[PDB]
PDB file of C-alpha atoms and ligand atoms in Angstrom:
ATOM      1  CA  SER A   1      11.727  43.984   9.303  1.00 32.64           C
ATOM      2  CA  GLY A   2      10.743  40.557  10.640  1.00 33.31           C
ATOM      3  CA  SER A   3       9.193  39.298  13.876  1.00 36.94           C
ATOM      4  CA  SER A   4      10.156  40.638  17.356  1.00 34.27           C
ATOM      5  CA  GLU A   5      10.917  38.283  20.305  1.00 32.47           C
ATOM      6  CA  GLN A   6       7.526  39.205  21.968  1.00 34.85           C
ATOM      7  CA  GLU A   7       5.697  38.377  18.702  1.00 33.84           C
ATOM      8  CA  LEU A   8       7.387  34.922  18.541  1.00 32.25           C
ATOM      9  CA  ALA A   9       6.992  34.240  22.308  1.00 30.46           C
ATOM     10  CA  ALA A  10       3.246  34.913  22.044  1.00 30.10           C
ATOM     11  CA  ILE A  11       2.810  32.782  18.900  1.00 32.81           C
ATOM     12  CA  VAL A  12       4.918  29.871  20.213  1.00 33.43           C
ATOM     13  CA  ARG A  13       2.771  29.884  23.440  1.00 35.03           C
ATOM     14  CA  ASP A  14      -0.443  30.028  21.288  1.00 32.33           C
ATOM     15  CA  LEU A  15       0.860  26.946  19.322  1.00 34.99           C
ATOM     16  CA  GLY A  16       1.100  24.786  22.514  1.00 36.33           C
ATOM     17  CA  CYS A  17       4.921  25.089  22.953  1.00 34.19           C
ATOM     18  CA  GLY A  18       5.119  27.085  26.215  1.00 33.56           C
ATOM     19  CA  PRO A  19       5.774  24.120  28.617  1.00 33.65           C
ATOM     20  CA  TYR A  20       8.690  22.887  26.414  1.00 35.00           C
ATOM     21  CA  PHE A  21       9.835  26.341  25.242  1.00 35.00           C
ATOM     22  CA  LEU A  22      13.029  27.882  26.690  1.00 34.59           C
ATOM     23  CA  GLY A  23      12.500  31.335  25.164  1.00 33.80           C
ATOM     24  CA  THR A  24      13.839  33.502  22.304  1.00 35.48           C
ATOM     25  CA  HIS A  25      17.560  34.367  22.322  1.00 35.72           C
ATOM     26  CA  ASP A  26      20.421  35.773  20.287  1.00 38.08           C
ATOM     27  CA  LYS A  27      23.409  33.674  18.933  1.00 38.55           C
ATOM     28  CA  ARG A  28      24.600  33.189  22.588  1.00 39.34           C
ATOM     29  CA  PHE A  29      21.864  30.629  23.443  1.00 36.27           C
ATOM     30  CA  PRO A  30      23.772  28.236  25.782  1.00 37.82           C
ATOM     31  CA  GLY A  31      21.968  25.060  24.776  1.00 38.02           C
ATOM     32  CA  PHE A  32      19.897  22.330  26.389  1.00 38.13           C
ATOM     33  CA  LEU A  33      21.619  22.079  29.793  1.00 39.25           C
ATOM     34  CA  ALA A  34      18.756  22.120  32.403  1.00 39.79           C
ATOM     35  CA  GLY A  35      17.325  18.544  32.164  1.00 37.52           C
ATOM     36  CA  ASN A  36      16.696  15.654  29.703  1.00 38.88           C
ATOM     37  CA  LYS A  37      13.132  16.812  28.767  1.00 37.55           C
ATOM     38  CA  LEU A  38      11.487  17.745  25.389  1.00 37.36           C
ATOM     39  CA  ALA A  39      12.832  21.260  24.865  1.00 38.00           C
ATOM     40  CA  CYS A  40      12.943  23.935  22.161  1.00 36.92           C
ATOM     41  CA  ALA A  41      14.035  27.582  21.537  1.00 36.13           C
ATOM     42  CA  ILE A  42      14.131  30.377  18.894  1.00 37.85           C
ATOM     43  CA  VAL A  43      17.671  31.670  18.393  1.00 34.17           C
ATOM     44  CA  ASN A  44      18.890  34.623  16.351  1.00 33.23           C
ATOM     45  CA  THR A  45      22.015  34.278  14.132  1.00 32.01           C
ATOM     46  CA  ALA A  46      23.304  37.585  15.524  1.00 34.01           C
ATOM     47  CA  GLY A  47      24.044  39.105  18.968  1.00 33.55           C
ATOM     48  CA  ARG A  48      21.277  41.306  20.587  1.00 36.83           C
ATOM     49  CA  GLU A  49      23.574  44.398  20.206  1.00 36.76           C
ATOM     50  CA  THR A  50      23.529  44.165  16.377  1.00 38.13           C
ATOM     51  CA  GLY A  51      19.697  44.323  16.581  1.00 36.33           C
ATOM     52  CA  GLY A  52      18.898  40.890  15.112  1.00 33.92           C
ATOM     53  CA  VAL A  53      19.395  39.463  11.588  1.00 37.18           C
ATOM     54  CA  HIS A  54      17.849  35.993  11.107  1.00 36.94           C
ATOM     55  CA  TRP A  55      15.722  33.504  13.068  1.00 40.22           C
ATOM     56  CA  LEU A  56      16.490  29.780  13.727  1.00 42.16           C
ATOM     57  CA  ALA A  57      14.564  27.095  15.694  1.00 40.69           C
ATOM     58  CA  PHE A  58      16.332  24.551  17.959  1.00 42.78           C
ATOM     59  CA  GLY A  59      14.713  21.456  19.399  1.00 41.08           C
ATOM     60  CA  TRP A  60      15.885  18.655  21.708  1.00 41.65           C
ATOM     61  CA  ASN A  61      14.364  15.191  21.722  1.00 40.79           C
ATOM     62  CA  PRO A  62      15.709  13.194  24.759  1.00 41.97           C
ATOM     63  CA  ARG A  63      14.317   9.785  23.543  1.00 39.73           C
ATOM     64  CA  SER A  64      16.645   9.848  20.507  1.00 35.67           C
ATOM     65  CA  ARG A  65      19.289  12.305  21.863  1.00 38.11           C
ATOM     66  CA  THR A  66      18.647  14.492  18.778  1.00 38.33           C
ATOM     67  CA  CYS A  67      19.157  18.208  18.447  1.00 37.36           C
ATOM     68  CA  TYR A  68      17.030  19.542  15.601  1.00 35.45           C
ATOM     69  CA  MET A  69      18.289  22.784  14.006  1.00 39.13           C
ATOM     70  CA  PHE A  70      15.715  24.453  11.696  1.00 36.60           C
ATOM     71  CA  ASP A  71      16.834  27.212   9.287  1.00 38.22           C
ATOM     72  CA  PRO A  72      13.752  28.131   7.134  1.00 34.82           C
ATOM     73  CA  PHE A  73      16.281  28.569   4.264  1.00 35.27           C
ATOM     74  CA  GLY A  74      17.949  25.137   4.942  1.00 34.35           C
ATOM     75  CA  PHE A  75      21.481  26.585   4.797  1.00 33.47           C
ATOM     76  CA  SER A  76      24.305  24.253   5.846  1.00 29.22           C
ATOM     77  CA  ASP A  77      26.377  25.165   8.931  1.00 29.37           C
ATOM     78  CA  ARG A  78      29.164  26.291   6.542  1.00 27.09           C
ATOM     79  CA  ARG A  79      26.722  28.697   4.788  1.00 26.72           C
ATOM     80  CA  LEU A  80      25.297  29.914   8.150  1.00 26.50           C
ATOM     81  CA  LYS A  81      28.844  30.720   9.310  1.00 27.34           C
ATOM     82  CA  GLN A  82      29.606  32.529   5.990  1.00 29.73           C
ATOM     83  CA  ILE A  83      26.348  34.483   5.445  1.00 28.52           C
ATOM     84  CA  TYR A  84      25.387  35.155   9.105  1.00 30.92           C
ATOM     85  CA  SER A  85      28.718  34.700  11.089  1.00 30.28           C
ATOM     86  CA  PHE A  86      26.724  32.093  13.117  1.00 27.86           C
ATOM     87  CA  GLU A  87      28.273  29.004  14.667  1.00 26.84           C
ATOM     88  CA  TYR A  88      26.520  26.702  17.193  1.00 27.54           C
ATOM     89  CA  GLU A  89      29.264  24.101  17.813  1.00 27.58           C
ATOM     90  CA  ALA A  90      29.870  25.276  21.446  1.00 28.83           C
ATOM     91  CA  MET A  91      26.042  25.004  21.958  1.00 29.18           C
ATOM     92  CA  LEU A  92      26.054  21.398  20.710  1.00 29.08           C
ATOM     93  CA  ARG A  93      29.095  20.531  22.908  1.00 26.33           C
ATOM     94  CA  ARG A  94      27.611  22.136  26.123  1.00 26.39           C
ATOM     95  CA  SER A  95      24.341  20.252  25.383  1.00 31.88           C
ATOM     96  CA  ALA A  96      25.813  16.731  24.691  1.00 30.76           C
ATOM     97  CA  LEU A  97      28.079  17.112  27.807  1.00 34.47           C
ATOM     98  CA  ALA A  98      25.130  18.129  29.988  1.00 34.37           C
ATOM     99  CA  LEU A  99      22.493  15.682  28.717  1.00 34.80           C
ATOM    100  CA  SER A 100      24.154  12.699  26.968  1.00 32.04           C
ATOM    101  CA  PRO A 101      25.824   9.881  29.020  1.00 29.00           C
ATOM    102  CA  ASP A 102      27.927   8.795  25.970  1.00 34.23           C
ATOM    103  CA  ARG A 103      28.659  12.545  25.294  1.00 34.07           C
ATOM    104  CA  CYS A 104      27.141  12.070  21.760  1.00 37.04           C
ATOM    105  CA  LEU A 105      24.119  13.566  20.018  1.00 36.51           C
ATOM    106  CA  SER A 106      22.508  13.481  16.576  1.00 36.97           C
ATOM    107  CA  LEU A 107      22.329  16.826  14.798  1.00 41.19           C
ATOM    108  CA  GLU A 108      19.364  16.904  12.393  1.00 44.83           C
ATOM    109  CA  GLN A 109      18.939  19.875   9.990  1.00 42.25           C
ATOM    110  CA  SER A 110      17.093  20.889   6.809  1.00 39.43           C
ATOM    111  CA  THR A 111      18.730  20.935   3.288  1.00 38.43           C
ATOM    112  CA  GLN A 112      15.638  22.692   1.800  1.00 41.46           C
ATOM    113  CA  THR A 113      14.246  26.205   1.839  1.00 44.03           C
ATOM    114  CA  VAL A 114      10.552  26.838   2.684  1.00 47.83           C
ATOM    115  CA  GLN A 115      11.180  30.573   2.424  1.00 49.62           C
ATOM    116  CA  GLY A 116      11.507  32.987  -0.535  1.00 50.19           C
ATOM    117  CA  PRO A 117      14.855  34.841  -0.702  1.00 52.10           C
ATOM    118  CA  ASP A 118      13.344  38.271  -0.003  1.00 51.54           C
ATOM    119  CA  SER A 119      10.877  37.135   2.672  1.00 51.72           C
ATOM    120  CA  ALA A 120      11.075  38.229   6.339  1.00 54.60           C
ATOM    121  CA  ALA A 121       8.812  35.409   7.654  1.00 54.07           C
ATOM    122  CA  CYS A 122      11.847  33.407   9.126  1.00 52.64           C
ATOM    123  CA  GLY A 123      10.641  33.861  12.748  1.00 54.72           C
ATOM    124  CA  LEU A 124       7.136  32.746  11.732  1.00 53.18           C
ATOM    125  CA  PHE A 125       8.359  29.553   9.880  1.00 56.12           C
ATOM    126  CA  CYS A 126      10.388  28.835  13.086  1.00 59.37           C
ATOM    127  CA  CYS A 127       7.087  29.014  15.043  1.00 59.87           C
ATOM    128  CA  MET A 128       5.465  26.539  12.604  1.00 62.04           C
ATOM    129  CA  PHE A 129       8.413  24.143  12.875  1.00 62.63           C
ATOM    130  CA  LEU A 130       8.322  24.302  16.741  1.00 63.20           C
ATOM    131  CA  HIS A 131       4.594  23.446  16.545  1.00 61.41           C
ATOM    132  CA  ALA A 132       5.548  20.371  14.453  1.00 59.70           C
ATOM    133  CA  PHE A 133       8.441  19.616  16.862  1.00 59.83           C
ATOM    134  CA  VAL A 134       6.334  19.702  20.091  1.00 58.20           C
ATOM    135  CA  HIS A 135       3.612  17.544  18.538  1.00 63.24           C
ATOM    136  CA  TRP A 136       5.880  15.061  16.624  1.00 63.29           C
ATOM    137  CA  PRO A 137       9.388  15.296  18.159  1.00 64.85           C
ATOM    138  CA  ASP A 138      10.511  11.960  16.594  1.00 65.97           C
ATOM    139  CA  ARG A 139       9.993  13.354  13.020  1.00 66.52           C
ATOM    140  CA  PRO A 140       9.410  17.172  13.011  1.00 65.30           C
ATOM    141  CA  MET A 141      11.090  18.068   9.658  1.00 68.20           C
ATOM    142  CA  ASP A 142       8.492  16.333   7.419  1.00 66.33           C
ATOM    143  CA  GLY A 143       5.879  13.523   7.474  1.00 68.95           C
ATOM    144  CA  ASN A 144       3.677  15.284  10.100  1.00 72.04           C
ATOM    145  CA  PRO A 145       0.341  17.278   9.782  1.00 77.65           C
ATOM    146  CA  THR A 146       2.159  20.658  10.221  1.00 78.63           C
ATOM    147  CA  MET A 147       5.255  20.256   7.989  1.00 83.67           C
ATOM    148  CA  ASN A 148       3.159  18.291   5.363  1.00 83.56           C
ATOM    149  CA  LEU A 149       1.466  21.720   4.749  1.00 88.96           C
ATOM    150  CA  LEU A 150       4.759  23.130   3.419  1.00 89.61           C
ATOM    151  CA  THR A 151       6.884  22.122   0.369  1.00 87.11           C
ATOM    152  CA  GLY A 152      10.637  22.242   0.860  1.00 87.24           C
ATOM    153  CA  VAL A 153      12.796  22.967  -2.167  1.00 87.98           C
ATOM    154  CA  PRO A 154      16.530  22.161  -2.474  1.00 84.75           C
ATOM    155  CA  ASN A 155      18.454  25.065  -0.742  1.00 84.04           C
ATOM    156  CA  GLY A 156      20.672  25.357  -3.863  1.00 84.40           C
ATOM    157  CA  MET A 157      17.592  26.504  -5.840  1.00 85.91           C
ATOM    158  CA  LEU A 158      16.833  29.445  -3.376  1.00 83.03           C
ATOM    159  CA  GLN A 159      17.638  32.215  -5.961  1.00 80.79           C
ATOM    160  CA  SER A 160      15.848  30.477  -8.929  1.00 83.87           C
ATOM    161  CA  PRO A 161      12.564  31.469 -10.738  1.00 83.12           C
ATOM    162  CA  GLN A 162      11.057  27.928 -10.951  1.00 80.87           C
ATOM    163  CA  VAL A 163      10.613  27.822  -7.138  1.00 83.05           C
ATOM    164  CA  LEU A 164       9.036  31.327  -6.240  1.00 83.01           C
ATOM    165  CA  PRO A 165       5.430  30.006  -6.871  1.00 82.19           C
ATOM    166  CA  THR A 166       6.191  27.211  -4.339  1.00 84.70           C
ATOM    167  CA  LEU A 167       7.958  29.552  -1.783  1.00 84.47           C
ATOM    168  CA  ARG A 168       5.017  32.061  -2.001  1.00 85.63           C
ATOM    169  CA  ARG A 169       2.431  29.271  -1.545  1.00 85.92           C
ATOM    170  CA  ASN A 170       4.482  28.162   1.550  1.00 85.01           C
ATOM    171  CA  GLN A 171       4.308  31.759   2.974  1.00 90.17           C
ATOM    172  CA  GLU A 172       0.470  31.928   2.315  1.00 90.32           C
ATOM    173  CA  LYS A 173      -0.047  28.493   3.954  1.00 88.66           C
ATOM    174  CA  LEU A 174       2.155  29.659   6.869  1.00 90.02           C
ATOM    175  CA  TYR A 175      -0.200  32.638   7.511  1.00 93.55           C
ATOM    176  CA  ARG A 176      -3.338  30.469   7.153  1.00 96.02           C
ATOM    177  CA  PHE A 177      -1.862  27.926   9.647  1.00 95.41           C
ATOM    178  CA  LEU A 178      -0.957  30.609  12.195  1.00 92.60           C
ATOM    179  CA  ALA A 179      -4.319  32.455  11.842  1.00 95.40           C
ATOM    180  CA  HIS A 180      -5.990  29.092  12.559  1.00 94.22           C
ATOM    181  CA  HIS A 181      -3.904  28.361  15.762  1.00 93.09           C
ATOM    182  CA  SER A 182      -2.823  31.742  17.204  1.00 94.15           C
ATOM    183  CA  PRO A 183      -5.164  34.488  18.604  1.00 97.26           C
ATOM    184  CA  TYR A 184      -2.107  36.812  18.890  1.00 98.21           C
ATOM    185  CA  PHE A 185      -1.391  36.324  15.125  1.00 95.58           C
ATOM    186  CA  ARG A 186      -5.116  37.016  14.337  1.00 92.21           C
ATOM    187  CA  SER A 187      -5.047  40.257  16.434  1.00 93.86           C
ATOM    188  CA  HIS A 188      -1.795  41.629  14.883  1.00 92.93           C
ATOM    189  CA  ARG A 189      -2.247  39.976  11.426  1.00 97.13           C
ATOM    190  CA  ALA A 190      -2.004  43.196   9.265  1.00 94.73           C
ATOM    191  CA  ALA A 191       1.236  44.359  10.974  1.00 93.45           C
ATOM    192  CA  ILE A 192       2.723  40.787  11.053  1.00 90.79           C
ATOM    193  CA  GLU A 193       1.935  39.951   7.336  1.00 94.93           C
ATOM    194  CA  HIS A 194       3.309  43.364   6.269  1.00 93.34           C
ATOM    195  CA  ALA A 195       6.563  43.367   8.343  1.00 92.43           C
ATOM    196  CA  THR A 196       7.347  39.682   7.366  1.00 90.10           C
ATOM    197  CA  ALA A 197       6.256  40.152   3.657  1.00 90.07           C
ATOM    198  CA  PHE A 198       7.378  37.703   0.928  1.00 90.11           C
ATOM    199  CA  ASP A 199       9.096  40.722  -0.807  1.00 91.78           C
ATOM    200  CA  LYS A 200      10.068  42.662   2.405  1.00 90.10           C
ATOM    201  CA  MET A 201      13.884  42.627   1.749  1.00 89.82           C
ATOM    202  CA  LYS A 202      13.294  44.429  -1.614  1.00 92.13           C
ATOM    203  CA  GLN A 203      10.748  46.829   0.081  1.00 90.48           C
ATOM    204  CA  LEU A 204      13.354  48.138   2.684  1.00 91.21           C
TER     205      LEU A 204
ATOM    206  CA  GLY B   1       7.964  19.399   4.571  1.00 89.80           C
ATOM    207  CA  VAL B   2      11.745  19.547   4.284  1.00 89.90           C
ATOM    208  CA  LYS B   3      14.334  16.868   3.574  1.00 88.14           C
ATOM    209  CA  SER B   4      16.935  16.645   6.327  1.00 91.68           C
ATOM    210  CA  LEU B   5      20.480  15.411   7.073  1.00 86.85           C
ATOM    211  CA  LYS B   6      21.269  13.573  10.331  1.00 83.64           C
ATOM    212  CA  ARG B   7      24.967  13.717  11.620  1.00 83.27           C
ATOM    213  CA  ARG B   8      26.378  12.123  14.832  1.00 84.81           C
ATOM    214  CA  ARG B   9      28.463  14.519  16.969  1.00 83.51           C
ATOM    215  CA  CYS B  10      30.632  13.247  19.864  1.00 83.37           C
ATOM    216  CA  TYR B  11      32.499  15.332  22.446  1.00 82.79           C
TER     217      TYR B  11
HETATM  218  C1  LIG C   1      13.629  36.559   8.591  1.00 81.43           C
HETATM  219  N1  LIG C   1      13.828  36.218   7.344  1.00 81.43           N
HETATM  220  C2  LIG C   1      14.058  37.843   9.129  1.00 81.43           C
HETATM  221  N2  LIG C   1      14.017  38.964   8.351  1.00 81.43           N
HETATM  222  C3  LIG C   1      14.455  40.165   8.822  1.00 81.43           C
HETATM  223  C4  LIG C   1      14.933  40.271  10.142  1.00 81.43           C
HETATM  224  C5  LIG C   1      14.934  39.110  10.938  1.00 81.43           C
HETATM  225  C6  LIG C   1      15.437  39.119  12.383  1.00 81.43           C
HETATM  226  N3  LIG C   1      14.622  40.020  13.188  1.00 81.43           N
HETATM  227  C7  LIG C   1      15.015  40.355  14.444  1.00 81.43           C
HETATM  228  O1  LIG C   1      16.046  39.899  14.933  1.00 81.43           O
HETATM  229  C8  LIG C   1      14.162  41.317  15.278  1.00 81.43           C
HETATM  230  N4  LIG C   1      14.883  41.748  16.499  1.00 81.43           N
HETATM  231  C9  LIG C   1      14.456  41.530  17.780  1.00 81.43           C
HETATM  232  O2  LIG C   1      13.410  40.960  18.075  1.00 81.43           O
HETATM  233  C10 LIG C   1      15.301  42.005  18.951  1.00 81.43           C
HETATM  234  C11 LIG C   1      16.246  40.811  19.179  1.00 81.43           C
HETATM  235  C12 LIG C   1      15.820  39.895  20.146  1.00 81.43           C
HETATM  236  C13 LIG C   1      16.589  38.775  20.459  1.00 81.43           C
HETATM  237 CL1  LIG C   1      15.921  37.672  21.635  1.00 81.43          CL
HETATM  238  C14 LIG C   1      17.812  38.537  19.798  1.00 81.43           C
HETATM  239  C15 LIG C   1      18.261  39.448  18.820  1.00 81.43           C
HETATM  240 CL2  LIG C   1      19.809  39.183  18.032  1.00 81.43          CL
HETATM  241  C16 LIG C   1      17.475  40.584  18.506  1.00 81.43           C
HETATM  242  N5  LIG C   1      16.006  43.317  18.747  1.00 81.43           N
HETATM  243  C17 LIG C   1      15.053  44.468  18.695  1.00 81.43           C
HETATM  244  C18 LIG C   1      17.074  43.635  19.745  1.00 81.43           C
HETATM  245  C19 LIG C   1      13.628  42.531  14.426  1.00 81.43           C
HETATM  246  C20 LIG C   1      12.323  43.081  15.064  1.00 81.43           C
HETATM  247  C21 LIG C   1      14.655  43.685  14.172  1.00 81.43           C
HETATM  248  C22 LIG C   1      15.606  43.496  12.957  1.00 81.43           C
HETATM  249  N6  LIG C   1      14.528  37.931  10.410  1.00 81.43           N
END
């Protein structure tokens, strides 16, 4: 169910993220502490011991002092804390203290889902976002060749019928994008598309 | 793409 950390590490590398990528972690990701460089990561909502639950993408732009948090589902921090028991306040504090002279940062996050409610492609959408983030770090969420390929829908509409055709088309365009840019995705395509299926949570 | 919300956080 979903993408493994090796799967994501290989795809992220294939996407041209490697030099700016800090790895794949669990909820205990410390933050952007090393230096004031373009940096990103893939962080799980849960601790490694639980086995993993959901994937999130975190980016740092030093020329705007912005931390981008990408939840493919566009849940608010309040909803992330409720649904997934995930909080990243300490992460934001450690980061702004380590990299911001004024001790302030801008937290930019999605309010729209790109993912169907039963889909297990969260890790893969995180890869796509990090591709958009490393190529357009000043505006990674939308208005760039990579995120222009997807159609975000208000998060509040996640469980509604009118949006499944859009959320499925997103998932098909996700695969097509990854097959175009990642040899690792191409090689493991059948196992990746099946384990991250649009309907995977119903097919447990 | 997705619509976003930008918030300033100071520590
Ligand atoms: C996306 N919608 C979605 N759907 C179902 C499951 C998941 C999350 N998948 C995982 O977390 C994987 N787990 C691991 O890769 C690994 C792990 C690694 C790291 Cl760096 C952190 C954590 Cl918390 C977990 N496990 C094996 C320890 C799946 C392959 C297993 C559920 N996302």
